[PDB]
Symmetry: C5
Subunit: 316 residues, 5 copies
């Protein structure tokens, strides 16, 4: 039998081993944009056929995890894993199940940290297509062929997963063929699109900015004769805009090097406030008309620009 | 005897193994709302019957932990564990106790990090029903049946536990039947309701906000003739409200994406201050009556709104 | 001999093993009030008698640490340890010493993190009685009896330890009997009282608050005729008190949920400043006497209140 | 055969083992300037010839990773590694491939943290030449000779790598000879120049500073007759410059002890603002001409100084 | 031969083993004053004579690291290590070299974290004499005698090490005799004096404070007639001094409980500014002479006090 053949894959020499995969994401622990990765716990299930491990019977038997050290198991590995570990809570979280016809069920609880590149250009409404790829580290396509057990039904838990900030709406599984120097491999890629919620940032960041712009508009009505009111409203507007900029800049650490969307909108609001103050100063200098015309020109142009920005960042 | 049968569960083929469970939470190390989990140390005790491990005698014997590697132990596992480890202080923290009739006592010190979903909508008075679920990773309900030794007496230490911010008032144990693709499992769920203290946030955050609103009310009495006093009181009110908002927003990191309760109350206070300032400005503009009427209208309506908010967030 | 009896404790069946303990705290690495624990390195020494490990001779012999895997060692464990590890610098930091009459010396370097509950009510002058408890995880009092080798002598290094913020003044060792569900255990508890230094917080936090209150007192002498000086002194007082409050609140993270002592004193100072400003405003309103009477009333009452607070928080 | 000769290197005594190396940087996880290191995942491939491991055949065979414990593998090590670990996702990420003529392919997934010294003098445009050096820890040049399989081809993935803040433009591999006390070693050094992006810091930090200097220039046009406008513009300029300095100083922790470039430019801008304010004060004192001459002198000299600084920090 | 004698030290019974030590600090990774320790990577080399490991020959042979598990190696350990680990990059970073006459070379790459007590009284110019002590954990002076191979030449890399903030100027090695309860041990202590750079803190913290004091001096020239200029200069001075105090207090976390030197100097500057403001207020009150006399008295006394402070904190 397979005494010292545990190093030899089933059908050592000839047809490769067809391993069917099943994934069950118990929970996506975190999604770090600063480190550009995601930590998630998965229930990796693999099913192959070992002709040397067959027996006479009708039913299957669940064996201890310590038997894994005596049998052959596929060298499955996450392609873009930075740090992963099999859970050892009480014993090794390994399920091994031997079947009559040779089927071997191998289940593991793996907490993995996969790095998916994130483009934060449309940061408030960005959709990140993050992938979890499983491949054989040592055995190429001529030795191990990885396959999905039930297509897109193989992966479970992603449909009902609701993260803190993101939400999976479209996930699917593919059987790609990776071409490396050592050889050709069959890679199983489960890719899912994480879309951040849109309402939170609007009601918590965009609404205060709109209120600041409204206060800047109101600042036009107050004239220079009432210097206390003008000074107070200007101080409040400037201080609130500075605090809003600070709060927006402190949400995400200085790690990204792209042009964001919330930053552009806040810069537009700050530029509008600065231009309003500069126009008030210029009107005062010229007087010692324009303000009345601005009181009607600013709302229409500002609303049109806001609609243009929204149409640009939602549709095209 | 069970020479190589340590991989075989007791009564391998036929009736399952009835394992009685006992829990003893020594300490809940932390409760992280940002990561939405809790780290706690538990004294997991399991009792089953091994017919192959029986002997002739009357008394029980405590064996070394290293004997665990030679016997069969259940593959108990925490369902929602992110990171757990058996303590190795001097030796492996394992108690194995063999009995005359076949009873096996298996005790472990496990520091586990279980993720329980937290809803922070009523954040100052939120009650989180966090669960600790134990299940067999490999053996289904037809092989291992998990049971509580003494019902709700089995779990000890939760009644006398007093955390820093929370307090357990109602905890109970259930025997649920989890239906997975591999098979049906008997899960033991100890769920406990953690209720945060109510007085600390009221006396440290709500009271300063009430004092700020009182100062805003007092600002009405001071007229425009004394510009220094009005300027000082307005500056103090605005600066204090901004600092209070900053302190409230820095307590919890930017991880939750829900509408909180302390945020709503602080926003109401900020809106009241802003409306008071705007009404003062409008009254000054109209004069160059309303303030006297407001001095009587504001207290009653404000108190009624506060009572309505309290009744909404305490009862229904 | 004890071929496979390494799993069997000495005198397996009958009188228990009397293990004498010796502790040597090399350094208390940290004392975290936010996590409510302390990390310290200890030189754990255990001495028992193994009748099966006796030989003919007169002298003792130091054996390699790898021999520990072949002998029986007590399952000593820290009762409230959150994370501990035996040091592996070059080899395993284990001293095993075999003696002629059967004495076995077992020394380990253990960096442990013990959680001791901290009451921060009198935070500037709090004394925390933190304990380090050693117990047998598996063997009860009928199998292993833990004893202190030399009573309060046994523990060394605590008398000469001077931490950054604390100072041990009274430490002692007790032999308690813990009653658990599994059985009764002999626990060795070394408890030490850590007292924080009193002068640092007085000279760095209380003195600036006293200077702020003195400046608030001086603010009474300046009249309303010199509006620049009054405005400057008021701005300086308010800004300094806000900065002092911020610095006091940022020293300890938002983890405790108790009423502190430094917070109470700073709140008293802030209330005094606010009351001084309010009284100045009320006197100005009434004039358009009281201030002169206050200039004499405030010092005596303030000093008496400070003495009462000091007597309350030092003696009773 | 090589029964106990796994401790003996191939050709034990005589000609050394020629090991050909291949590197494949899957991802550079992080580049920490505060800790002055970089964490990256590499696919280390080694090819040597074991005369004792030859067999009769024509094709190669991929063996299990557990066979590595039975064969001889080179003691390759990263020279400046602070913390590294071979990935264990499902099994040990080891590829072992035995060939007919004796070639042995050994592939490992290693996440390493190499410390490369960073000179942050020209911090916005600094180019760091960070190295990854592989050497034999035990076997000197007379026992193991490390060689690159394909010269600069050998390393793959660096050309297409685009980090968050840096960009590799020139990387190359060298075979150096390290002279140590124990012996002479053949070190394989892959050194790559990481150049930080230039546009982000200009458009996000330098542009606000330029706008602040422009506002300071505009402050000259406003005269002392309009004290509200002058006070507002001065307050805005000072507050904005302080906030910009704070934001620049909070980007990098207080770890470097060098004279940076962004700090010098921001200090120049702050000195310009302070000198403008001082000159305005001096002109007011002298009046109770210079400002008109300054309105023309400042732009030319400021632009020339900026061009000189740019030429200094880009070319020489 | 030494079949089971690997637990027995060479010359088991009689003369002790003379182990010659060699140190090579590859890099001091960090020096944490908050935790009062330093993390550094060392190349620990030990040379002893094993009479049972001799063979017939003329040359030495480098054996695999896995042979270490079969031989006897000294139980060297860092006396004040909080956390250390032998590097496992590809294999165990162990060099074992057997010689003809019995010499055994044992080299290890150890990243260690040694706690050296730090006195931050003269914090800007503090010199910390931090030690790295190596001792035998189990074998006393009658079993293992640790010796330096070449005295001060034994340690390499410290002379050319230039850290971020510190600089080693005087390091030396000593053979001390530690007296413990178990026995007397030969400890090898390499102690080095780390001196922080003096110019960085002067040009980045002391220079802004001096500029603030200069601005406070200039504030005397401006009279009360120009209230805008006086208000602006006072606001700038107070705000800049507060920001400088905040920046100085945020450099080091609230962990030390000593009287620093930079804190004393900044407090002196703050007291000077406060006294200048108080003297201006008192002069204004008395007028409604002193300022002219102060304009000459302040520079000389301030310079003399600064020189006295410098002489105190540099020489005696
Ligand atoms: C023992 O037998 C071995 C196999 O039976 C022999 O190894 C092979 O040796 C040949 C040549 O000696 C190698 O061919 C080269 O392989 C290179 C790497 O694949 C090729 O480079 C091309 O491909 C890589 C990968 O995509 C590109 O990155 C690169 O830019 C280029 O396009 C060469 O072009 C060439 O084909 C062959 O790869 C080796 N096989 C393996 C598995 O390494 C070995 O030489 C024999 N030894 C003796 C002494 O006879
Ligand atoms: C060797 O013997 C094995 C067992 O004796 C055989 O394995 C079984 O094979 C059958 C069909 O070949 C499997 O039946 C299917 O199982 C699917 C998964 O359970 C079912 O899917 C349904 O259930 C899942 C889980 O709830 C849902 O997620 C899914 O949406 C769907 O509702 C199918 O509907 C179908 O029943 C059976 O499960 C296999 N058993 C195991 C333990 O995997 C094996 O085929 C035999 N091999 C040979 C060569 O004869
Ligand atoms: C095989 O032999 C075993 C021992 O020889 C048997 O185990 C014992 O079984 C008896 C009853 O079947 C147990 O008695 C109960 O134990 C409970 C737990 O101790 C008690 O509860 C009380 O004490 C706990 C602990 O303090 C409290 O928390 C609780 O609130 C309550 O006050 C019960 O009151 C009762 O005494 C005994 O404990 C078992 N021993 C052990 C070591 O578990 C076993 O049943 C035998 N099996 C067969 C098939 O005969
Ligand atoms: C058993 O055999 C061993 C080897 O066969 C012997 O070890 C050698 O012993 C000799 C002298 O006893 C050593 O020579 C010295 O080595 C020093 C270290 O290399 C040299 O120092 C110089 O080089 C170092 C390293 O560059 C510099 O840092 C230093 O400043 C100086 O420039 C000495 O100058 C001198 O050569 C030799 O190194 C040993 N070999 C090894 C591998 O250690 C051993 O003595 C024999 N024992 C007996 C009992 O006979
Ligand atoms: C078996 O043989 C063993 C050794 O052959 C015996 O162990 C020794 O037992 C004697 C007394 O029974 C111990 O003497 C005491 O040791 C104390 C600890 O050293 C001393 O305390 C003094 O020294 C310590 C350490 O510096 C100080 O901290 C303390 O304050 C005090 O000054 C005592 O004063 C006294 O000497 C001896 O130490 C033991 N040896 C060891 C290695 O532990 C053992 O008893 C024998 N058993 C039987 C049954 O005969
Ligand atoms: C899964 O669904 C995707 C669409 O989201 C589709 O492209 C793919 O073919 C599906 N895979 C299978 C085979 O079910
Ligand atoms: C434990 O308590 C819960 C809640 O009261 C109850 O539903 C359950 O039946 C109890 N279990 C036992 C066995 O007492
Ligand atoms: C240790 O000290 C405590 C406190 O003084 C005392 O109660 C106890 O009895 C002492 N133990 C011995 C054995 O000296
Ligand atoms: C690798 O590239 C460097 C830089 O061009 C060159 O100096 C070196 O010789 C190259 N090595 C080989 C073997 O091509
Ligand atoms: C090492 O140098 C120190 C002085 O730096 C000296 O005290 C010591 O004796 C020297 N050791 C030897 C043996 O060279």
């Amino acid at each position: 039998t397979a005494g010292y053949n545990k190093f030899l894959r089933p059908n050592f020499g000839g047809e490769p081993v067809q391993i069917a995969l099943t994934l069950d994401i118990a929970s996506i622990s975190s999604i770090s944009e600063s480190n550009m990765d995601y930590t998630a716990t998965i229930y990796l299930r693999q099913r192959w056929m070992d002709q040397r491990l067959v027996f006479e019977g009708n039913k299957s038997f669940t064996l201890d995890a310590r038997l894994v050290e005596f049998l052959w198991v596929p060298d499955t590995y996450i392609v873009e894993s930075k740090k992963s570990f099999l859970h050892e809570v009480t014993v090794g979280n390994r399920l091994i199940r031997l079947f009559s016809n040779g089927t071997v069920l191998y289940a593991l609880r793996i907490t993995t940290t996969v790095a998916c590149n994130m483009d934060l250009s449309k940061y408030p409404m960005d959709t990140q297509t993050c992938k979890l790829q499983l491949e054989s580290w040592g055995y190429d396509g001529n030795d191990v062929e990885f396959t999905w057990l039930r297509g897109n039904d193989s992966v479970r838990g992603l449909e009902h997963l609701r993260l803190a900030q993101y939400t999976i709406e479209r996930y699917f599984t593919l059987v790609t063929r990776s071409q490396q120097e050592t050889g050709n491999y069959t890679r199983l890629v489960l890719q899912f699109e994480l879309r951040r919620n849109v309402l939170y940032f609007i009601l918590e960041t965009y609404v205060p900015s709109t209120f600041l712009v409204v206060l800047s508009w109101v600042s036009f009505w107050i004239s220079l004769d009432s210097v206390p009111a003008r000074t107070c409203i200007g101080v409040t507007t400037v201080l609130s805009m500075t605090t809003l900029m600070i709060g927006s800049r402190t949400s995400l650490p200085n790690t990204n090097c792209f042009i964001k969307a919330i930053d552009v909108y806040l810069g537009i609001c700050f530029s509008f406030v600065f231009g309003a103050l500069l126009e008030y100063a210029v009107a005062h200098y010229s007087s010692l008309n324009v303000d009345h015309y601005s009181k009607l020109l600013f709302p229409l142009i500002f609303m049109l620009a806001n609609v243009f920005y929204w149409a640009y960042y939602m549709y095209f």
